[PDB]
Amino acid sequence: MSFEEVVQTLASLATVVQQQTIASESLEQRITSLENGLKPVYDMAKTISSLNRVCAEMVAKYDLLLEHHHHHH
Amino acid sequence: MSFEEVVQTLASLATVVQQQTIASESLEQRITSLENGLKPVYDMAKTISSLNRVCAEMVAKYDLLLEHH
Amino acid sequence: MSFEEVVQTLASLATVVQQQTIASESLEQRITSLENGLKPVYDMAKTISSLNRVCAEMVAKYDLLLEHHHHHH
Amino acid sequence: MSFEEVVQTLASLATVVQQQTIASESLEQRITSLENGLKPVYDMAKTISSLNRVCAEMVAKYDLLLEHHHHHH
Amino acid sequence: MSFEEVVQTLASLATVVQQQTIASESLEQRITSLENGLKPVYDMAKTISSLNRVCAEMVAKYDLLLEHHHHHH
Amino acid sequence: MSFEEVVQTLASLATVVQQQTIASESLEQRITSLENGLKPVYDMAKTISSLNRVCAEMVAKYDLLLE
Numbered sequence A, C, D, E: 001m002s003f004e005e006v007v008q009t010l011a012s013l014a015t016v017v018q019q020q021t022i023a024s025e026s027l028e029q030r031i032t033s034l035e036n037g038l039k040p041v042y043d044m045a046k047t048i049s050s051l052n053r054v055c056a057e058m059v060a061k062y063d064l065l066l067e068h069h070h071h072h073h
Numbered sequence B: 001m002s003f004e005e006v007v008q009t010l011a012s013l014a015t016v017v018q019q020q021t022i023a024s025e026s027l028e029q030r031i032t033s034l035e036n037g038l039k040p041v042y043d044m045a046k047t048i049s050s051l052n053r054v055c056a057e058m059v060a061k062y063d064l065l066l067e068h069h
Numbered sequence F: 001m002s003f004e005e006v007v008q009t010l011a012s013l014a015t016v017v018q019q020q021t022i023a024s025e026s027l028e029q030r031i032t033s034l035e036n037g038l039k040p041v042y043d044m045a046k047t048i049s050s051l052n053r054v055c056a057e058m059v060a061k062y063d064l065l066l067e
Helices: A003-058 A063-071 B003-036 B041-044 B048-068 C001-070 D003-060 D065-070 E004-073 F001-038 F039-046 F048-066
Strands: none
Touching: A003 B048, A003 C001, A003 D003, A003 D065, A003 F001, A063 B003, A063 B041, A063 D003, B003 C001, B003 D003, B041 C001, B041 F001, C001 D003, D003 D065, D003 E004, D003 F048, D065 F039, E004 F039, E004 F048, F001 F048, F039 F048
């Protein structure tokens, strides 16, 4: 290798390593964003329990008809 | 108040009573069909206890893994 | 078995039969109304069965999220 | 027809008419029960409104993922 | 550039590159974790759409019960 | 560091940099794939507006029929 090629190559490598850094950080931003977007979905449990209680309440309104069904079917 | 009139009234009244039997039987069958339509009510009601169970299990798991850990 | 007896009993029956026509028209109106009214009621019970299935589906899918939190946190 | 056969007839019609009154009262009880069974379902509005709130709460958990979607595609 | 300046730049470039590797391995791990976590999250979004349709169906069926009330009461 | 060691180091780093460009295109595509998965979420969210409205209309109608 000539000293010229060592210099050109080292200069071309630095321009790439520079671009990789900018690309990384940007990627890291999108990753963090997605991670953070996921977090609130862990608290779905409470809303699912509310859905269950709504379901149970809807069913309960049919108690009298269900009793009629038990006697006539 | 003629005997003739009483006989004719009885026969006419008999027809009317038969007409009422027919009409009443149709009303019965209409109510029966309405009662037959309670089936989805029964099928609906049958699903709630299983749902209450899987939800209770979810709540426990959420409690253990997220409320504390 | 007197003629006055036959006539009075026939007049009695006549009015009872007339009464029943009236009672039957009333039940017929009430049945028509129930046919109209119970149609959406029964239809809704079908939608409530769907709601219950969708709720259980939510629960099972959210369970996978819980397994992820257990497995990755 | 004879006077004998009138009492025969008149008596026989009273049994049918009597029987019809019983069948009709039995039917009236079934109608009443179905009418009473329908009533509680009128109150489903409040519960459907609760379901709507649940739906909106569930959607709201995805606000941050949805923000990410907006900025990226 | 002199020879001593080429070695300055090289040892300086190696340190960002060795850092970048460690950073990218960490980013890789975080994306892998997201790939697992977002599976049930996206899946639940589909169930929530179903839920929303079910709610709209409940409202439309119940509307007919409200129409029944309006006409018969 | 001799001239030879500077050359060997350069080629050593050139290889490491090559593998990092490759890995970054990979990590880029995985993220982009996850992001495309946000459509079902966008689709879910666009429906809530209509749903609130028809429910509000139902509630109002119910209240009117009570009054």
